[PDB]
Design a protein around this ligand. Structure first.
Ligand SMILES: Nc1ncnc2c1ncn2[C@@H]1O[C@H](COP(=O)(O)OP(=O)(O)OP(=O)(O)O)[C@@H](O)[C@H]1O
Ligand SMILES: Nc1ncnc2c1ncn2[C@@H]1O[C@H](COP(=O)(O)OP(=O)(O)O)[C@@H](O)[C@H]1O
Ligand SMILES: Nc1ncnc2c1ncn2[C@@H]1O[C@H](COP(=O)(O)OP(=O)(O)O)[C@@H](O)[C@H]1O
Ligand SMILES: [Mg+2]
Ligand SMILES: [Mg+2]
Lengths: 1245, 674
């Protein structure tokens, strides 16, 4: 506290000196204890305990004194109660550094976001709002004559109120002479609008209309003719026509918002005047007129705060003259008229208002609009989990002292204890307010006090409290007799849209609203229920604003096109000759189509053509970006399509993603697994880099692979040192721009599920504030080029707060057709060699066309030949597609994804081409010709489809897939009558060969008859060893699942040990498994080598690869939001090929690491099913029990090895084994797990 | 059943006002039954024949068993003297629970005045209140003083501490603690268990309500000039009494039980005072024309009372009351507060202009209040009585619940036999997908089939576990408890159902819905798409009937190429069987009309409980700017009898000379299901 400020010592001279003395003694004791850090030496210090008790006493006293000073400062200027202790210290301490106060003005005041200072920062010239709007003080306040923050800040507030009052007085003076005219010049009207503030212009229009109506009624009460009201209505019509003509043109955004507010107000004024004319109101005291909000302006009043009176029904208020800046004007729908009447009636009786109803009806918005209409500072308390309870008593004290309104958002969602505490505080405050209503109470001296924070606080009469409720529950019992409740059951969306469209220049606003509102109702009802579907009134407002923007863009386009040629331009003529329905439908589709799933798009278009008949959507193509996308997709072997062509939907999704990036700063891709999200944003980034010339850098930051503290950073509780988290470090590195990072497009992709733990701190980032707050206190402003991106699978565990804060493109699984995946595989095979390691890898980047390097390696030639051979099988109506479609019908032990099977098949075809290469290298004299290569490739293709699609299923269903293949294929198959085709293998020669030819009847010796390191070869054993070799030569995170004891780990070890290059690190997982275990395994068996390219994690043993056996992938427990943390870490570190450190916060790239693991069926208890995003890379093998014949063979060999000890008993080797096998089978089919959970009978028994 | 046809005098008893008094002999028995047997047999007969008089038969059955005067002592007012002086221990707190909105401290005040024992009354809810309560209790323990602690329901924690304190005390014989409170679940169970609970309900009756209101308002406030204020207050009190009594007959009177309490009364009184003072300017008398009737009506309809009203039709009904009562014609000597009390007698406004005359008039009201006083139909009392009878039977059945594997097994087997097996999903055709009706029916059949397979799997697994062959998972144990206890399982609630619905009724309606969906699927398979337009579907049977209305609108708009926003619904009731359907007309079955009869598509008021519309036809015609006629009334179509879900609002035309205000006040509405 006393070191982070420069003026803090001046304000508390006794205190600062006291702490300084305490600090000198404490530093002396610190040096003394540092000399002898031993505890025994510490306890032997002469009188350390007495001095320490003295220090504790004094430190507590100065801390209390500091609190008392802060309380005095708050009480001497009420608005500091709205801002925290640390920020209070920052404001009071940085008196000379006035520029540091600019970031707290948005909390103390309503619309005040900055202060216009002088050249030397000694005189506050005026106030600047958040939108850049400024108010110039009539008499500027001088900091020099009032050095204390208190006095000059209070003078700022007071003279701001005074200058607003004077501005309103002269504004009324101008709008009077505006009103008393049958024709207003648009130029002078626009000059008046620009020259004054939006709030003040709106109030001036309201005052002028109210006084005109009052005078008209007064004249009518004596005359009896309706002419004055007709004149007033005609004047309002003329003003609306002028405003519409002006808003049709091009205006600056501030003047545009002023025009929108004026149109919204004058529409309501015209409606009220029409109602008065129709009702035939003659006297000014009729309730048909008294019920409307009336404004009375008397400049003769000496006090500015009492200059303006706002009266409706019985209640009459005084304008608080709080400066609100450019707020959002409410439409004044009749439901809000009922709201205004009820709330003002409640405040007249000194009761708080409690509107209730479903969300989205505009409860807190209506309360805030009512507060702003009276010019009262209104705070909205979001009652969600972002609840600031500890400082709310201070906030209520501030509301009492300054006269600011306070509104809660959803009072029922508070927890019971917070609800009770806030209810008690509100009850005390409301009783204090009701004490103002006693007629016998003296008004000359009215010291009304309320008990808050164990002290008496004066409650201003102007302050009020609103509690917004939402049934489905009701107000607390103590607050039921003090609050007037109101039912916000249904907003009048038709009038909402009609007025807002009329304010946007749409001539046919009524028809468009009457069409758009039921259309949104149909979108809510007919369309499939999704979490991210927002069809409330806010979405409708945003869509209508976007439609207005599109219409203005069309008008500007037509005007520029005409000015390019030799014809004149008339804005009204262009606007008249313009289809509004097409603009509205284009806006709706642009806003809503990307958010929709594949099946809902035809539903959207059907409903949209039903409501809007005869109009169509024309897609806005981007030819330059289209060509760039085509070039980039060709560069990295993707399939590209236009419109209905194959790949057209994916390109459309990429274009929608580009639009969302242009519009929003935060956005999400919420496509299911294996839909093309990563490739979409990668190709978009590279296409933008190649088009705009701005280098694009992406920071894939997995949010769940590391803890929240490791992601955001944690502060040391003792030494108060701040450690930057991964996201915070990345953001700080971008902001600093030591290497020109502000000149490059940074995309912070998260690539992980979203849950409401690590997105809580991102809420401020995703807001319009674009600010990041840290526990230390530093505030990080999001640079314009930084684009927060989320690449998630679903939204099952995401709050509405983070979803509504960002744009979204849904990448439905129908987007990624199997044809383009096949084309990608074929192109990658035809271009990317496999024998290449570090060489021929960067050379692909070096070669834009790779001319002259076609016959670089015989590997490339043979894989081109193989791809040419298998091309007729990977077409749309091909063998592989039909096999995949059939296998989707088949059931699998793990849930089945298309890309898992496709990746497994691609890997085994890669192994087929590598086997061809090996045979070619072993036969230099006769290389394999085209015919033998074709035979082998077709045979291995059938084999690979069979072992990839059905590799996860069980035996007879594997035979089912095999017979399906046999009836759908044309390649010759084995001709044996009654043998499964999976039993056959493919040799180098074209013909098949049974696996039994590779199953020798070995003879184990007497010893090690049952030793663990004994693997008697069987059909299943040899097939699985071959499959393991195939999937380990590709270095994939292969996964084996099966019933316990089936032989998973054994066969994996047997297959892996045949390769003298990989060492297995067995890791056993369970419910307590965390990525920290993998980190310890890494730092034990590996080291972080500092390669110049980047930090590389490699095993200590050079030349030998590392395999990490994870015995149980399933057991790690799902979190409360699912998505096992270690599984997500493994996914990130196998897909992106690396992970982020927890100390340095730099990318680490793995080298020579594999992640082969074992599992159990998910149907077994405690086996959590694996996520699709992780299962996509990993192939899965079903290692079932050996079965009768395999058991007989293996254990006959074992029993022969046994009874070799006793020569006489060897004759009983096979009967004994047969007895063992039959007894085991009978026991296994007798004691099912249903009877008892421990009745598992594995070959381990 | 045979005896029903053989008795010619059955009609005079069935339609009798009090059939339960004289139940004719209709049972066959071998030996003449004892009087208790006669009572129970007649109770069953009344339950089957006239369930509304179930309570009345119940009282005589209790009288036959336990003596006539068993319930007599309850009717007499509660005597505090003997119950407090005797049979209550000094350490037992007297918990005077009351229905919210009605106080009970006055009874204890009168008791203390009669017993000439000084007493202190303490409010609860504030810290100094707690301190004063503790000090007064401590003083009373050592001095034998009575202590009141008002509104103790606000502090459950302090209630637990107070109960703990009262457990460990040595109270004096004259000491006694009175805890007045309101009905609220937040209060501790231990305090209720250790106290002599007393329930103080407000006495029902319009007369009692207006006496309470007039006693609450001080005489000086009413006596304030002008003298028109007394009549204004009497009108306000009458209106408050009408709505408060109408709250009882729900949902017929009010679509839901709103919280029309004393706070609204005080707010309305303050509004009347302020506006009458503003208009009067202190004059001793003002003409009734000059009274701001519009201001009072608007404030009492939008803010004072209509703030808590969310349903549009309840707001319309409140507007009807306010426009009928608060008018200049109210000051006329022949003004009729209520019309058609018994068809002949009409309650008239008292001619007096003073508060004492108004009190004298209200005290002279006959003690024969009927729902027609409130504007409700006379059979509303019958509906309330039969609802109370059903609730009383359910309450005793829950009481009697305090082995079952075979009963659950046979119940589940019967349910599985009753419920149909399978639903066939509609086949997706490229031509059929464009039809909105086909899309809606496809969604219906898909979600209904999902629910059907879920329910059938659950029931079959319940049958298996009741056979002792399957383990009990958490979902299973929960569902078994729900079925055994009778609560509808939460899993089988994917479509809106009436609140407090037993599982058996849900199963019956589920089977009916799946039968209807099977018929729809068969028709769609047979005809493809033409038959789906010419199918008569019950709106109650459909899971989301508003989606059906939307689908009909969409189909009409698409077939005739009109825009969807230019279509309005016209309802025609045709009694002919199999009436022809126009190209833009859809048949509807099962609609039930409440409180009216429709003849030639023309409403007429009736005293029947409900009237079944033979064949409703919904037609979508192009919107016309022609003004609505004065004889056209808008009726809500509630999903069920609870009147909690609104689907669409039909329009109908009034027959002969019937006032639409009566239609609004009588609670006339259409129900998709009964
Ligand atoms: N347009 C395309 N044309 C051809 N192949 C494509 C295309 N898009 C994607 N693929 C292929 O399909 C794979 C899946 O795409 P991508 O990796 O982008 O998915 P993802 O959505 O990030 O996956 P997951 O959500 O499962 O993590 C790509 O790696 C690529 O091999
Ligand atoms: N009368 C109205 N005029 C214009 N917009 C409205 C109106 N009523 C509601 N809205 C919009 O509906 C949204 C509702 O949000 P809000 O009022 O904050 O939550 P709630 O409706 O739950 O109180 C607001 O964003 C507001 O813009
Ligand atoms: N073909 C085979 N050759 C050798 N041993 C086998 C064979 N089939 C089954 N076994 C036996 O089955 C057991 C498999 O157990 P194991 O794979 O370790 O279980 P888990 O995979 O659950 O750890 C081994 O102990 C092994 O002796
Ligand atoms: Mg909200
Ligand atoms: Mg991805």
């Amino acid at each position: 506290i006393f070191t982070g400020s420069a003026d803090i010592k001046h304000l508390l001279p006794v205190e600062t000196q006291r702490f300084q003395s305490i600090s000198t003694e404490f530093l002396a004791l610190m040096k003394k204890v540092s000399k002898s850090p031993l505890v025994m030496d510490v306890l032997n210090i002469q009188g350390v305990q007495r001095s320490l008790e003295r220090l504790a006493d004094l430190l507590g006293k100065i801390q209390k004194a500091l609190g008392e000073y802060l309380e005095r400062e708050r009480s001497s200027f009420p608005r500091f109660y709205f801002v925290g202790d640390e920020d209070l210290l920052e404001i009071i301490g940085n008196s000379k550094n006035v520029a540091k106060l600019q970031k707290h003005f948005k909390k103390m005041f309503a619309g005040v976001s900055s202060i216009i200072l002088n050249e030397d920062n000694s005189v506050v010239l005026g106030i600047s709002s958040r939108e850049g709007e400024e108010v110039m003080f009539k008499t500027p306040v001088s900091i020099t004559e009032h050095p204390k923050i208190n006095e000059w800040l209070t003078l700022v507030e007071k003279e701001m109120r005074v200058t607003l009052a004077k501005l309103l007085a002269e504004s009324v003076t101008e709008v009077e002479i505006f009103g008393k005219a049958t024709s207003i010049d648009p130029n002078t009207y626009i000059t008046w609008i620009d020259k004054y503030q939006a709030q003040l212009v709106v109030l001036s229009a309201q005052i002028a209309w109210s006084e005109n109506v009052e005078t008209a009624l007064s004249s009518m009460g004596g005359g009896g003719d309706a002419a004055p009201l007709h004149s007033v209505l005609s004047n309002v019509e003329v003003t609306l026509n002028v405003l519409a003509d002006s808003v049709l043109m091009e205006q600056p955004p501030l003047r545009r918002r002023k025009l929108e507010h004026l149109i919204t107000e004058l529409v309501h004024q015209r409606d009220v005047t029409r109602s008065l004319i129709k009702s035939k109101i003659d006297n000014a005291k009729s309730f048909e007129w008294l019920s409307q909000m009336r404004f009375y302006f008397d400049p003769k009043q000496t006090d500015v705060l009492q200059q303006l009176s706002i009266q409706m029904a019985n209640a009459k208020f005084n304008y608080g003259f709080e400066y609100l800046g450019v707020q959002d004007k409410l439409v004044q729908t009749p439901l809000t008229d009922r709201c205004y009447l009820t709330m003002t009636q409640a405040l007249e009786a000194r009761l708080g208002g409690s509107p209730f109803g479903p969300a989205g009806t505009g409860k807190t918005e209506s309360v805030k609009a009512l507060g702003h209409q009276l010019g009262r500072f209104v705070l909205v308390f979001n009652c969600d989990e972002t609840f600031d309870f500890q400082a709310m008593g201070r906030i209520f004290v501030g509301l009492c002292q300054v006269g600011a309104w306070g509104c809660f958002d959803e009072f029922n969602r508070l927890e019971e204890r917070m609800l009770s505490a806030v209810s008690q505080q509100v009850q005390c405050i409301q009783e204090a307010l009701r004490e103002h209503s006693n007629p016998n109470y003296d008004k000359t001296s009215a010291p009304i006090t309320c008990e808050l924070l164990n002290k008496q606080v004066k409650v201003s009469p102007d302050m009020a409290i609103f509690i917004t409720m939402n049934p489905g529950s009701n107000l607390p019992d103590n607050l039921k007799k003090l609050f007037r409740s109101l039912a916000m059951t249904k907003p009048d969306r038709q009038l909402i849209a009609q007025v807002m469209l009329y304010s946007q220049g749409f001539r046919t606003a009524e028809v468009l609203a009457n069409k758009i509102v039921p259309f949104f109702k149909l979108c809510d009802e007919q369309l499939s229920s999704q979490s991210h579907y927002d069809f409330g009134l806010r979405a409708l407002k945003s869509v209508l604003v976007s439609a207005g923007n599109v219409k203005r863009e069309r008008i500007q386009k037509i005007k520029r096109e005409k000015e390019e040629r030799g014809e004149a331009v008339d804005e009204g003529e262009i606007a008249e000759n313009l289809p509004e329905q097409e603009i509205l439908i284009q806006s709706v589709c642009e806003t809503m189509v990307p958010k929709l799933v594949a099946e809902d798009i035809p539903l959207l278009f059907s409903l949209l053509s039903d409501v809007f008949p005869g109009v169509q959507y024309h897609r806005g193509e981007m030819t330059a970006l289209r060509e760039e996308l085509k070039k980039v997709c060709q560069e990295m072997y993707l399939t590209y399509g236009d419109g209905e062509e194959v790949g057209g939907m994916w390109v459309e999704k990429v274009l929608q993603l580009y639009q969302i990036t242009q519009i929003n700063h935060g956005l999400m891709m919420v496509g299911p697994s294996g839909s093309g999200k990563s490739m979409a944003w990668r190709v978009l980034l590279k296409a933008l880099e190649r088009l705009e010339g701005v280098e694009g850098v992406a920071h894939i930051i997995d949010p769940k692979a590391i803890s929240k503290d490791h992601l955001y950073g944690t502060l040391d509780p003792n030494t108060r040192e701040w450690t930057d988290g991964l996201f915070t470090h990345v953001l700080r590195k971008i902001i600093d721009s030591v290497r020109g990072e502000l000149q490059k497009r940074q995309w912070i992709v998260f690539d992980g599920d979203v849950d409401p733990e690590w997105v809580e701190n991102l809420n401020s980032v995703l807001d319009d504030n674009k600010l990041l707050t840290l526990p230390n206190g530093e505030r990080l402003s999001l640079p314009p080029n930084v684009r927060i991106m989320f690449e998630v699978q679903d939204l099952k565990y995401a709050t509405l707060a983070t979803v509504s804060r960002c744009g979204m493109v849904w990448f439905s699984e129908d987007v990624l057709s199997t044809d383009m995946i096949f084309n990608n595989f074929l192109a990658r095979l035809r271009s990317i060699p496999l024998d290449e390691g570090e060489d021929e890898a960067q050379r692909r980047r070096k070669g834009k066309e790779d001319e002259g390097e076609e016959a670089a390696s015989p590997m490339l030639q043979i894989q081109r030949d193989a791809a040419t051979i298998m091309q007729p099988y990977f077409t749309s109506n091909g063998l592989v597609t039909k096999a995949l479609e059939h296998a989707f019908q088949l059931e699998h032990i793990m849930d089945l994804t298309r890309l898992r099977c496709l990746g497994s098949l691609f890997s085994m075809l890669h192994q087929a081409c590598r086997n061809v290469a090996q045979y070619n290298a072993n036969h230099p004299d006769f290389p394999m010709q085209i015919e033998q290569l074709e035979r082998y490739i077709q045979r291995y293709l059938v084999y690979a489809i069979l072992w990839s699609l059905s590799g996860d299923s069980r035996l007879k269903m594997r035979a089912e897939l095999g017979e399906y293949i046999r009836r759908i294929t044309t390649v010759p198959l084995p001709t044996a009558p009654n043998i499964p085709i999976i039993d056959y293998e493919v040799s180098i020669s074209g013909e098949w060969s049974p696996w039994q030819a590779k199953v020798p009847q070995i003879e184990v010796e007497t010893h090690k008859v049952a030793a663990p390191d004994v693997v008697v070869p069987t059909l299943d054993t040899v097939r699985h060893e071959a499959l393991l070799y195939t999937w380990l030569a590709e270095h994939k995170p292969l996964v084996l699942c099966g019933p316990p004891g089936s032989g998973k780990t054994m066969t994996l070890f047997s297959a892996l040990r045949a390769l003298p290059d990989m060492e297995v690190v067995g890791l056993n997982f369970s419910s307590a498994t965390t990525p920290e275990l993998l980190l310890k395994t890494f730092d034990h068996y590996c080291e972080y080598r500092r390669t110049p390219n980047g930090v590389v994690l490699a095993p200590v043993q050079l030349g030998k690869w590392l395999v990490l056996f994870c015995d149980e992938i399933n057991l790690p427990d799902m979190d409360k939001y699912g998505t096992q943390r270690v599984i997500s870490f493994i996914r990130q570190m196998v897909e992106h090929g690396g992970f982020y450190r927890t100390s340095d916060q730099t990318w680490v790239k793995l080298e020579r690491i594999q992640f082969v693991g074992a599992c159990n069926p998910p149907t077994d208890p405690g086996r959590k099913p694996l996520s699709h995003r992780f299962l996509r890379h990993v192939p899965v093998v079903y290692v079932d029990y050996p079965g009768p014949a395999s058991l007989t063979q293996i254990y006959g060999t074992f029993n022969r090895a046994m009874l070799r000890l006793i020569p006489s008993l060897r004759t009983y080797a096979e009967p004994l084994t047969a007895a063992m096998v039959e007894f085991y089978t009978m026991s296994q089919e007798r004691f099912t797990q249903d009877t008892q959970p421990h009745y598992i009978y594995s070959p381990r028994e | 059943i045979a005896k029903v046809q053989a008795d010619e005098q059955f009609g005079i008893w069935l339609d009798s006002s009090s059939p339960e008094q004289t139940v004719p002999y209709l049972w066959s028995e071998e030996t003449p039954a004892t009087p208790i047997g006669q009572a129970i047999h007649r109770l069953l007969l009344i339950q089957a024949f006239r369930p509304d008089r179930l309570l009345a038969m119940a009282h005589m059955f209790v009288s036959t068993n336990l003596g006539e005067s068993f319930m007599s002592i309850m009717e007499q007012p509660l005597d505090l003297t003997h119950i407090v002086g005797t049979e209550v221990k000094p350490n037992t707190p007297v918990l005077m629970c009351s229905v919210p909105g009605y106080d009970a401290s006055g009874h204890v005040e009168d008791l203390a005045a009669e017993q000439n024992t000084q007493i202190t009354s303490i409010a609860i809810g504030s810290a100094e209140g707690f301190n004063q309560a503790d000090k007064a209790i401590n003083t009373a323990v050592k001095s034998g003083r009575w202590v009141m602690l008002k509104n103790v329901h606000l502090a459950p924690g302090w209630l637990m501490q107070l109960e703990k304190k009262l457990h460990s005390l040595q109270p004096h014989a004259c000491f006694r603690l009175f805890l007045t409170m309101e009905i609220n679940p937040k209060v501790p169970v231990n305090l209720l268990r250790a106290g002599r609970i007393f329930v103080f309900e407000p006495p029902p009756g319009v007369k009692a309500n207006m006496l309470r209101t007039f006693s609450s308002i001080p005489v000086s406030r009413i006596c304030k000039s002008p003298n028109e204020r007394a009549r204004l207050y009497f009108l306000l009190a009458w209106f408050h009494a009408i709505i408060q009594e109408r709250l009882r007959y729900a949902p017929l009177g009010w679509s839901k039980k709103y919280e029309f309490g004393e706070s609204d009364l005080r707010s309305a009184c303050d509004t009347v005072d302020t506006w009458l003072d503003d208009t009067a300017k202190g004059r001793q008398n003002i003409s009734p024309d000059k009274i701001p009737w519009s201001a009072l009506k608007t404030l009492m309809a939008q803010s004072i009372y209509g703030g808590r009203v969310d349903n549009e039709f309840d707001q319309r009904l409140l507007n009807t009351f306010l426009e009928r009562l608060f008018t200049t014609r109210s000051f006329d000597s022949e003004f009729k507060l209520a019309c058609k009390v018994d068809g002949h007698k009409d309650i008239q406004m008292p001619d007096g202009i003073r508060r004492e005359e108004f009190v004298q008039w209200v005290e002279l009201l006959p003690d024969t209040q009927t729902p027609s006083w409130l504007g409700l139909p006379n059979n509303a009392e019958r509906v309330l009585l039969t609802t109370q009878g059903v609730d009383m039977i359910s309450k005793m059945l829950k009481m009697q619940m305090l082995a079952w594997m075979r009963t659950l097994h046979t119940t589940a087997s019967n349910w599985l036999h009753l419920i149909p097996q399978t639903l066939s999903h509609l086949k997706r055709t490229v031509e059929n997908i464009k039809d909105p009706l086909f899309r809606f029916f496809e969604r219906e059949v898909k979600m209904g089939a999902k629910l059907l397979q879920d329910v059938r799997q659950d029931l079959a697994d319940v049958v298996q576990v009741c056979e002792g062959k399957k383990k009990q998972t958490n979902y299973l144990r929960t569902l078994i408890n729900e079925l055994v206890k009778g609560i509808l399982p939460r899993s089988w609630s994917h479509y809106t159902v009436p609140a407090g619905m037993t599982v058996i009724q849900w199963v019956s309606d589920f089977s009916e819905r799946i039968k209807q969906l099977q018929n729809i699927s068969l028709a769609a398979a047979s005809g493809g798409a033409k038959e789906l337009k010419n199918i008569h579907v019950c709106l109650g049977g459909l899971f989301v009937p508003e989606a059906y209305i939307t689908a009909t609108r969409q189909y009409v708009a698409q077939a005739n190429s009109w825009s969807l926003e230019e279509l309005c619904l016209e309802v025609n009731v045709t009694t002919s069987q199999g009436a022809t359907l126009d190209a833009c007309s859809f048949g509807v079955t099962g609609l039930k009309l409440q409180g009216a009869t429709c003849n030639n598509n023309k409403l007429s008021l009736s005293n029947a409980i409900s009237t079944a519309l033979p064949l409703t036809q919904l037609r979508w015609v192009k919107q016309t700017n022609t003004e609505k006629k004065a004889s056209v009334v808008t009726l809500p179509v509630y999903l069920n009898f609870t009147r909690a879900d609104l689907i669409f609002t039909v329009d109908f035309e009034i027959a002969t000379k019937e006032d639409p205000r009566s239609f609004y006040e009588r609670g006339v509405a259409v129900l998709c299901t009964e």
